[PDB]
Amino acid sequence: DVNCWRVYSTGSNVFQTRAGCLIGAEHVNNSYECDIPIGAGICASYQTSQSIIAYTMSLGAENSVAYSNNSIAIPTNFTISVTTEILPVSMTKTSVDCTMYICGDSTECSNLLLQYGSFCT
Amino acid sequence: AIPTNFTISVTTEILPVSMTKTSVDCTMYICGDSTECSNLLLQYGSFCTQLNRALTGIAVEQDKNTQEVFAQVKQIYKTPPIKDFGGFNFSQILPDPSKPSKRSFIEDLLFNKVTLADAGFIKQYGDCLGDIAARDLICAQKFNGLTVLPPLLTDEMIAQYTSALLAGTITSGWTFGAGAALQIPFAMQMAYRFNGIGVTQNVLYENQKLIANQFNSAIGKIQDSLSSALGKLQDVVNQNAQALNTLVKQLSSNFGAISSVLNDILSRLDPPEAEVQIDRLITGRLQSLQTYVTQQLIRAAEIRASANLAATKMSECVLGQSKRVDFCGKGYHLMSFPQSAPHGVVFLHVTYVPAQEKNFTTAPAICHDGKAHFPREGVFVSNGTHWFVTQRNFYEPQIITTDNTFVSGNCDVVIGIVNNTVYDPLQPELD
Amino acid sequence: NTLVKQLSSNFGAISSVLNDILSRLDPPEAEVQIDRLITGRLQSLQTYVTQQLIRAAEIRASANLAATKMSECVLGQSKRVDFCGKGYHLMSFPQSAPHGVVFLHVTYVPAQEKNFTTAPAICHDGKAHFPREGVFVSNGTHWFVTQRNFYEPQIITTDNTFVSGNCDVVIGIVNNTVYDPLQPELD
Ligand SMILES: *[C@@H]1O[C@H](CO)[C@@H](O[C@@H]2O[C@H](CO)[C@@H](O)[C@H](O)[C@H]2NC(C)=O)[C@H](O)[C@H]1NC(C)=O
Ligand SMILES: *[C@@H]1O[C@H](CO)[C@@H](O[C@@H]2O[C@H](CO)[C@@H](O)[C@H](O)[C@H]2NC(C)=O)[C@H](O)[C@H]1NC(C)=O
Ligand SMILES: *[C@@H]1O[C@H](CO)[C@@H](O[C@@H]2O[C@H](CO)[C@@H](O)[C@H](O)[C@H]2NC(C)=O)[C@H](O)[C@H]1NC(C)=O
Ligand SMILES: *[C@@H]1O[C@H](CO)[C@@H](O[C@@H]2O[C@H](CO)[C@@H](O)[C@H](O)[C@H]2NC(C)=O)[C@H](O)[C@H]1NC(C)=O
Ligand SMILES: *[C@@H]1O[C@H](CO)[C@@H](O[C@@H]2O[C@H](CO)[C@@H](O)[C@H](O)[C@H]2NC(C)=O)[C@H](O)[C@H]1NC(C)=O
Ligand SMILES: *[C@@H]1O[C@H](CO)[C@@H](O[C@@H]2O[C@H](CO)[C@@H](O)[C@H](O)[C@H]2NC(C)=O)[C@H](O)[C@H]1NC(C)=O
Ligand SMILES: *[C@@H]1O[C@H](CO)[C@@H](O[C@@H]2O[C@H](CO)[C@@H](O)[C@H](O)[C@H]2NC(C)=O)[C@H](O)[C@H]1NC(C)=O
Ligand SMILES: *[C@@H]1O[C@H](CO)[C@@H](O[C@@H]2O[C@H](CO)[C@@H](O)[C@H](O)[C@H]2NC(C)=O)[C@H](O)[C@H]1NC(C)=O
Ligand SMILES: *[C@@H]1O[C@H](CO)[C@@H](O)[C@H](O)[C@H]1NC(C)=O
Ligand SMILES: *[C@@H]1O[C@H](CO)[C@@H](O)[C@H](O)[C@H]1NC(C)=O
Ligand SMILES: *[C@@H]1O[C@H](CO)[C@@H](O)[C@H](O)[C@H]1NC(C)=O
Ligand SMILES: *[C@@H]1O[C@H](CO)[C@@H](O)[C@H](O)[C@H]1NC(C)=O
Ligand SMILES: *[C@@H]1O[C@H](CO)[C@@H](O)[C@H](O)[C@H]1NC(C)=O
Numbered sequence: 001d002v003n004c005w006r007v008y009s010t011g012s013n014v015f016q017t018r019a020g021c022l023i024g025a026e027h028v029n030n031s032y033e034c035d036i037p038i039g040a041g042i043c044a045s046y047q048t049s050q051s052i053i054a055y056t057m058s059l060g061a062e063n064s065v066a067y068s069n070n071s072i073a074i075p076t077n078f079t080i081s082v083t084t085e086i087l088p089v090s091m092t093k094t095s096v097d098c099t100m101y102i103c104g105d106s107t108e109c110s111n112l113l114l115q116y117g118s119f120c121t
Numbered sequence: 122a123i124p125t126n127f128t129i130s131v132t133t134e135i136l137p138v139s140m141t142k143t144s145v146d147c148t149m150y151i152c153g154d155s156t157e158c159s160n161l162l163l164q165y166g167s168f169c170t171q172l173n174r175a176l177t178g179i180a181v182e183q184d185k186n187t188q189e190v191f192a193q194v195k196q197i198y199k200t201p202p203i204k205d206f207g208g209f210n211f212s213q214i215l216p217d218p219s220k221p222s223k224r225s226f227i228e229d230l231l232f233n234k235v236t237l238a239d240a241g242f243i244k245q246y247g248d249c250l251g252d253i254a255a256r257d258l259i260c261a262q263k264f265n266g267l268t269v270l271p272p273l274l275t276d277e278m279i280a281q282y283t284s285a286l287l288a289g290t291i292t293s294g295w296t297f298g299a300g301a302a303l304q305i306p307f308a309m310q311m312a313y314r315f316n317g318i319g320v321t322q323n324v325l326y327e328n329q330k331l332i333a334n335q336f337n338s339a340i341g342k343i344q345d346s347l348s349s350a351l352g353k354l355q356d357v358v359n360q361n362a363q364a365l366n367t368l369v370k371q372l373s374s375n376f377g378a379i380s381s382v383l384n385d386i387l388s389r390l391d392p393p394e395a396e397v398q399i400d401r402l403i404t405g406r407l408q409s410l411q412t413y414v415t416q417q418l419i420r421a422a423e424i425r426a427s428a429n430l431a432a433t434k435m436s437e438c439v440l441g442q443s444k445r446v447d448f449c450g451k452g453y454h455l456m457s458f459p460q461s462a463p464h465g466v467v468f469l470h471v472t473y474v475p476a477q478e479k480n481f482t483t484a485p486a487i488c489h490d491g492k493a494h495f496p497r498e499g500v501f502v503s504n505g506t507h508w509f510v511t512q513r514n515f516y517e518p519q520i521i522t523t524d525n526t527f528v529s530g531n532c533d534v535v536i537g538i539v540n541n542t543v544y545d546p547l548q549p550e551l552d
Numbered sequence: 553n554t555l556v557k558q559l560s561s562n563f564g565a566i567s568s569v570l571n572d573i574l575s576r577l578d579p580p581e582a583e584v585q586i587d588r589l590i591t592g593r594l595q596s597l598q599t600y601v602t603q604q605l606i607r608a609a610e611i612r613a614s615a616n617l618a619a620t621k622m623s624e625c626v627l628g629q630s631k632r633v634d635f636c637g638k639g640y641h642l643m644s645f646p647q648s649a650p651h652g653v654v655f656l657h658v659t660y661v662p663a664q665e666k667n668f669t670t671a672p673a674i675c676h677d678g679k680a681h682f683p684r685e686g687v688f689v690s691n692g693t694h695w696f697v698t699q700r701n702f703y704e705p706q707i708i709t710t711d712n713t714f715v716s717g718n719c720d721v722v723i724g725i726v727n728n729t730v731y732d733p734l735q736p737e738l739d
Binding site for chain 1: 555559570571574579582583586587589590593594597598600604607608611614615617618621637638639642649651652653654655656657658659660661662663664665666667668669670671687689698700701702703724
């Protein structure tokens, strides 16, 4: 919530993003894949002397299709590819002894807790 | 009953994909700027850490949802300069290269129908000092530790992703979803898709102008119905806003204490007697934060199911042609186009609808010479006096020949067989 | 482990240890402190159980998805796009993992593409010929019909196309000959 001062220290490398004022990072004109998300399209990384750099994330490579009204492209060879997919199916089963947790081995606490048995059930 | 004409229909489907990301400063909400309350609250630090862990899980999940729906392909295709698509006009859904935001006309219309609670994420301290505070609801939220975090992808990046998806589908059909995009003329792709609902290619090639005109008119109807709808996307905004404002309002509860104001208690009472009242207030305000976080978790689970559905629709309706009924609109699915909406996605489903039906008498088989003839891929019909074979979804009568049927058995077993002649188109040539 | 750590909270009592309270205080004065501790620890257990319920719902959705994948990718061949990997799905093999499953999806990927000129139909004798299940392509000088996903050129014959109408309506029709593989045999 600062437009670059309500900051702890000014230092240098003060850079303004729509996510806020960023202090302590050098801004570069490249566009890499996102390492650490900052927000509003801005990402950060630790690069090469080593320093924190802040950039605008790239979405991917740009290639234009050669479209015409009488032109087709047919594959001539194929590839057989094997890929993996991971899925969770189950989690740990747990049980709680309510009196053991709340009172330990205190008899008086158990006599007091007898008023809340419905909640443990 | 066989249809004789068709209809090309475009319908819309709206899906929520993400919700607002929020963070809480626990001490700011519970104690304000009271040092004594903070020293008392140091006994409950684990609960504030636990609440923030749950909220950060929700916040990263929102970006994962948006990535899974919109960022499937990593090639940013560009639409060709020459717009020769056989008479189909996609200008209304392709990006306008003159507006600041490179958004299509329909996306611009959609974005003006959902009103966000706050535009922008930089509200400075000097901007609301004095009167403006406690009147404006956002500043009232921010003076009590309740902040809204911005999403990772901007609107412009999502518009870029949708334009890449559109260019891929209209220049390469469905090939770009399985590997490299292979270009093909748009009418030949349309003929392929007609093959996929059981209609021969010649129907498309003969009726191409009518089909293109029907598509263009339907797109115009979509446009004219939007400039006149998005309740599923407005209620998400409303729910988040209402929850944050309810948290701000719950700060006036006593919870069984003398007052709900800490400064009033701290004057007029000494520490040993002020501690019990402060303790009541602390317990109440921790309970309020806990309730907020629980309901945020349940809502995030619902949004996550919706975003999984949106990703499945993007894969199966936009990157291919789906044969499962009613998944991609009403009618036989032809193709779909995505458009980005604030916190969501809109799908334009183009489907095929059978239009004008006529009545015919029909028969399972034909008995020619003690043989039973069955259609290869059609149905036997009669106009009253004569017998033809046609295709099920469009009426195109033809003469029954041997290159048109197949024989199996005699005529003594099939229940409703009829007597007719089969041409056999070789006898004239042999003579 | 968070449940174990939350046992050191006072919840507004003199101490978080029951034995410390029970010595130094008589039952009527120890009861109010014990009551504070009891309320706090019941709240902790309640929070744990609620978050366990929400997590179990998410795992249940994941397991339903895994069962659907097992049915449609391993016990059959799926035609829905991207459900069983990237590419045209051929088959899948399951492997068990601790608390989960791993799927090995074998798919088919088109590899090396070549450019051709194409046409919707062929005009032979005032008739329009369309491919039965292929596409018409040209290497530049000659015209063949092939299949869409693999390049295997063939001569256009009548047992290979089908006729519909004349040549006056189709937008991009071209002129070529259709073999008709019966005339040589009749002669
Ligand atoms: C930070 O403040 C600067 C200075 O006021 C803002 O820059 C202005 O933004 C408005 C918004 O459209 C423009 O009309 C002005 O021309 C800009 N002026 C200058 C000198 O740049 C800026 O918008 C603020 N930062 C953020 C992220 O909102
Ligand atoms: C089709 O692709 C395969 C590989 O995917 C080609 O086989 C390779 O051919 C090169 C030389 O041509 C060899 O050095 C490799 O060892 C071969 N690989 C394998 C796995 O055998 C094949 O030649 C291609 N066919 C055509 C017609 O292009
Ligand atoms: C099939 O349906 C289309 C409309 O869905 C018909 O085209 C219309 O024909 C009427 C007169 O016959 C014209 O007034 C309309 O302007 C036409 N609409 C369009 C979009 O061109 C077509 O005639 C029908 N064909 C048959 C054989 O019934
Ligand atoms: C495709 O559709 C667009 C929009 O429907 C057409 O552009 C309009 O054309 C009319 C004239 O018929 C003009 O009065 C409008 O102002 C145009 N609108 C825009 C936004 O340009 C366009 O002519 C259609 N055909 C082609 C080939 O683009
Ligand atoms: C059913 O279809 C038959 C075959 O097309 C129709 O007979 C044709 O009628 C037209 C119009 O009189 C003639 O020009 C053709 O020569 C006829 N063909 C034959 C083979 O006779 C017949 O009219 C139709 N019957 C009904 C009741 O509509
Ligand atoms: C279809 O044709 C067959 C024979 O071509 C007919 O079967 C004969 O019908 C006559 C008179 O109905 C009987 O006397 C014969 O005994 C039948 N069986 C033979 C000749 O094997 C059959 O009835 C015809 N179906 C009709 C007219 O609906
Ligand atoms: C297109 O294909 C035709 C038909 O295969 C090619 O013509 C053949 O060329 C080979 C090599 O010279 C000859 O052995 C055949 O006898 C030719 N067949 C005919 C029917 O002429 C032609 O070379 C190809 N054109 C291009 C530009 O690649
Ligand atoms: C395909 O063949 C048809 C006839 O076989 C051509 O149509 C004739 O073309 C000539 C010269 O272009 C005209 O003078 C005739 O009037 C056309 N119509 C007839 C004879 O009915 C057609 O042009 C050919 N297509 C080509 C060469 O691309
Ligand atoms: C980045 O680009 C801007 C404008 O294009 C330029 O003024 C600036 O110097 C560039 N920075 C670097 C490090 O090249
Ligand atoms: C088909 O015949 C039935 C029988 O009366 C009639 O009710 C129906 O309207 C007919 N359908 C058409 C399209 O003529
Ligand atoms: C249809 O019903 C009629 C009686 O209404 C009967 O004579 C005829 O055999 C039936 N046809 C079939 C195929 O069952
Ligand atoms: C097909 O032709 C276009 C037109 O220039 C070209 O850019 C593209 O590389 C060609 N594809 C192949 C596989 O040669
Ligand atoms: C393809 O475009 C050319 C002009 O570039 C045009 O002459 C030709 O008729 C078009 N073909 C079809 C099938 O529309």
